[PDB]
Each structure stands twice: as C-alpha cells, then as structure tokens.
Amino acid sequence: LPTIRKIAIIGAGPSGLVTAKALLAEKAFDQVTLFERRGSPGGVWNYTSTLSNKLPVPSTNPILTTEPIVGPAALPVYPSPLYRDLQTNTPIELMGYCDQSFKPQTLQFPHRHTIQEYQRIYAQPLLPFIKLATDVLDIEKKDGSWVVTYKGTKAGSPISKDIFDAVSICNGHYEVPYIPNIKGLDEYAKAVPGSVLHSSLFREPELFVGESVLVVGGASSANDLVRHLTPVAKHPIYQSLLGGGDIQNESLQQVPEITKFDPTTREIYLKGGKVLSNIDRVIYCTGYLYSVPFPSLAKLKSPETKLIDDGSHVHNVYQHIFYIPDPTLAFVGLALHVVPFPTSQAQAAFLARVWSGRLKLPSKEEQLKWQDELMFSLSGANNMYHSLDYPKDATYINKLHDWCKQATPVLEEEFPSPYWGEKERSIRENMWSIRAKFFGIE
C-alpha cells in the first residue's frame, strides 16, 4: 500500500534494532513497533546459562517451534547459542554499526561481554518502541494490510492482533538446529541422553574433561569447539569433515563424513570404511536452518510465492530483502558469511528509503531476473543463496550505500549507510588471518 505509515518489526536483535533506527530516521512513519519474545533486546547477545530443553535429533524441519524454558518464578527464557568464553570472529574495525564505535582499548576480537554491552547501549533509546516478552504467532496479508498475531510471553497472556502497512522480519537464522538424518543417529541419541549435542548447547568446556569427543563440521563452530576442547577433552579430538581433512596429529584427527551410528556397538561409521568407537560426545557443529514459523507464510508453497522449503535459505527475496510478490514484507539479516551489524544496517538504510517512497525498486520482472541469475550461479547449492563471502559483501554494501545516496529529498539528518573503502576491504579479505594472528593460531 505504497504510502506506508505503520511498520511492524519482528525481532529486537541487532537486525531488528538497526532496522528500527533507520525507519524512524525517515521521519515518515507514524508507528514503528518491534516485537521480541525475549525479556530484552540484543538477540543472541543475551548469554544464557540455560540450555534448550529439547534438542531435536536429527533436525531437518525448518518450521520447528522454539520452546522456551518456563517456571513459576521467572519470565520465559529463550536460550542463546553463545558459549561462555566466546570472543568475536569479526574485528572491531568492521563489526559495529558505522555510527557507534567501540570504547577505546577494546580488544580487536572482544569477549561477548563487550558486544552484549554494545547492543545494550544501542537498544536503550528504542525500548519504548519495543513490545518485550511478546511472541509473534503469525503474519498474513488480509484485506489491504498485514495482520500480525502475537501473544504476550507470560502464562495467561491473551492472543492479540494488529495491522500494519509493512512487516520487517528480523527473526534471525541461528535458532533451529541442523542435524542431518543419519541412519541410527536418533536411536544412538535417545539411548544415552547427552551423548549427542549440537553446538547451540555448548556453554562450558569443563564438562568434557577426560571425554573422547567427535566434532562434526568444518566451519567456525567446529573449528572453535575443537580449539576450546583441546586443553580439556581426551586426546585426540575427532573431527568429521565432508570430504575428510588433512590434519592427523596427536590432539586432532580429521576424518571423513558419517554414514551411520551403530546403536548396539555404539560405533560410528565414516565414509571410507573408517570406524569410531567409545565416543563419549558427538557434537554437531553443522549449523542451522532458516525459519519462517508463521502459518500464513509457511503454507505458501508455489515457486512464485514461497518463502521457505528445506530451510537452506529464504526464497523470493529481491536483494535478500524484499518479498518479490509483495514488497511490503521484507527481511533483514539473512546474509551469510558477512559481518552482521554493518550488513544489516546497509539493508536497513536501503529498506527505509524504499518504504518511505524516497527510493523506487526496479520492476517486478527485473527483480525476478535478479533472482533467476542468482539461482543459476548457485548451481543447485541453495544453501549458498544468501552467502556474500568477500568480495560479495563489500560490493553489496557499497552498492546499497550508493543507491541510498540517490534518495530524495535530502533530509536534515540522513541515517548513515556504511561504506567499505580500500582500508576496510583489506581487513575483510584477510579477516581470518588477522583473527588467527590475534588468537595466536593456525
């Protein structure tokens, strides 16, 4: 409904928060409301000693309902995947929003305390705009607007409904765990509670002292876990990569993917006949699934209207943002392999100028073309759909930055679009090396 006045933002995490600030900066909307199931903003940067109560093993359904921990004495808690000693894998020179720097003397790859404090400070001015401890149940286009159904998170809260001209989903994509359905795993898991875990459950490494562990995966979660487990777990630590690996030392034994778990002998069979036994813990660091747990959106199955299928990505989103069929529905934060805060801010700035009419999206067919060209380049690798590994991310943000400058009319105060110059790009290109040197590794 072009003239947009009332906007609903689903999620008060880093993406939702920056989206709110960008929208409010347009000085064109009458109502900007954020919905958050947690008692506080900041998304995953809400460290919780509390673990998810029921980890589905295996896990391939991207719809899976998130079950918070409830009690008569506390507000419902939604566990965050952050672990106790976590430090960022993104340097301070790049990871913050462009209009809020880190205090002087911050470590280049700070502890999560620093980022949680950063988010706390960022969210402060937006608290009166957020409906905290409120779980959005569903979203759907009814009549000429969007109807978002939500229920206060507390026991006994009534189910409510409100309508908006636009809805920005910033619900995050690191909540629903992804554990491949291997033959025998389920049984192997239910026979010994605690024998099979997912990275989202890791908190304190002292739990693994003396234990023989198998880390399954080969990305940041896997490599980080292997590192944190090295000084405590029984040597060597095993790591199952898809296509094996080369590292075969005393403390680390990279092996090929898993074929099946033998529940009786509790043996683990790896592609290539390789067999493992006496594994105390199997920790799945296999990532997550994208999720759109909203009935009216999840039922959409047709190629032209669907949003989610296998959870490898969110479909039909021009520039990973605007729902092609109806641009009054957008997403912020879907990007993979990026520096989160700056990337979501880049999208937010663009999103705001488009919903306030100060910018126009290309035609619908041209948007669909953009998608067709993307799918083609993916070569069937749909889980790479939202991946913007450098230099894609730098190009992407600078593209949005330049598009935003075209907005008219010019406002007295223009919400900033980040831009990565030669200096920034360089850091982003050697990011993992700069990180390795910081933690004295590799």
Ligand X SMILES: Cc1cc2nc3c(=O)[nH]c(=O)nc-3n(C[C@H](O)[C@H](O)[C@H](O)COP(=O)(O)OP(=O)(O)OC[C@H]3O[C@@H](n4cnc5c(N)ncnc54)[C@H](O)[C@@H]3O)c2cc1C
**Using CB under 8 A as the criterion, which residues of the chain lie in contact with its own copies when the complex forms?**
39-40, 46-51, 55, 71-75, 77, 79, 84-85, 103-106, 111, 113-114, 116-117, 120, 132-133, 153-154, 193-194, 197, 201, 203-207, 209
Task: Name the phi and psi angles at 133, rounded to 5.
Answer: 50, 50
Task: State the Cα–Cα distance between residues 91 and 94, nearest whole angstrom.
Answer: 6
36 binds, among ligand X, ligand NDP, its own copies, none (CB under 5 to 8 A by kind): ligand X
Give the chain's radius of gyration (CA, Å): 22
Q: Which pair of structure tokens corresponds to residue 328?
A: 């009054």
Task: State the Cα–Cα distance between residues 207 and 330, nearest whole angstrom.
Answer: 41
Choices 86-94, 159-167, 265-273, 301-309; region in contact with ligand X by CB under 6 A: 86-94
Nearer to ligand NDP, 134 or 240 (CB): 240
43 binds, among ligand NDP, its own copies, ligand X, none (CB under 5 to 8 A by kind): ligand X
Q: Which pair of structure tokens corresponds to residue 209?
A: 């002292």
132 binds, among its own copies, ligand NDP, ligand X, none (CB under 5 to 8 A by kind): its own copies
The correct pick among 58, 79, 91, 172 for binding ligand X (CB under 6 A) is 172
Task: State the Cα–Cα distance between residues 400 and 405, nearest whole angstrom.
Answer: 9
Contacts of 86 (CB under 8 A, 6+ apart): 111, 112, 224
The DSSP bridge partners found for residue 258 are: 270
Choices 183-191, 273-281, 334-342, 361-369; region in contact with ligand X by CB under 6 A: 334-342
When asked if residue 165 is in the footprint of ligand X (CB under 6 A), the reply is: no
When asked if residue 167 is in the footprint of ligand X (CB under 6 A), the reply is: no
| Residue 90 is labelled as binding a ligand | yes
Position 279, amino acid = I
Could you give the angle at the alpha carbon of 131 between the alpha carbons of 335 and 305, nearest 5°?
Answer: 45
Pattern 4-43, ligand X, x by CB under 6 A: ------xxxxxxx------------------xxxx----x
15 binds, among its own copies, ligand X, ligand NDP, none (CB under 5 to 8 A by kind): ligand X
Position 306, amino acid = K
- The string of DSSP letters for 376-398 reads HHHTT-GGGTTB-TTTHHHHHHH
**Site residues, ligand NDP (CB under 6 A):** 86-89, 174, 180, 199, 216-222, 224, 240-242, 257, 285-287
Q: Which pair of structure tokens corresponds to residue 73?
A: 């004495």
Nearer to ligand X, 94 or 255 (CB): 94
Position 150, amino acid = Y
| Residue 43 is labelled as binding a ligand | no
Task: State the Cα–Cα distance between residues 20 and 349, nearest whole angstrom.
Answer: 10
Provide the binding-site residues for ligand X, judged by CB under 6 A: 10-16, 35-38, 43-44, 78, 81-82, 88-90, 95, 135-136, 170-172, 174, 333, 339-341
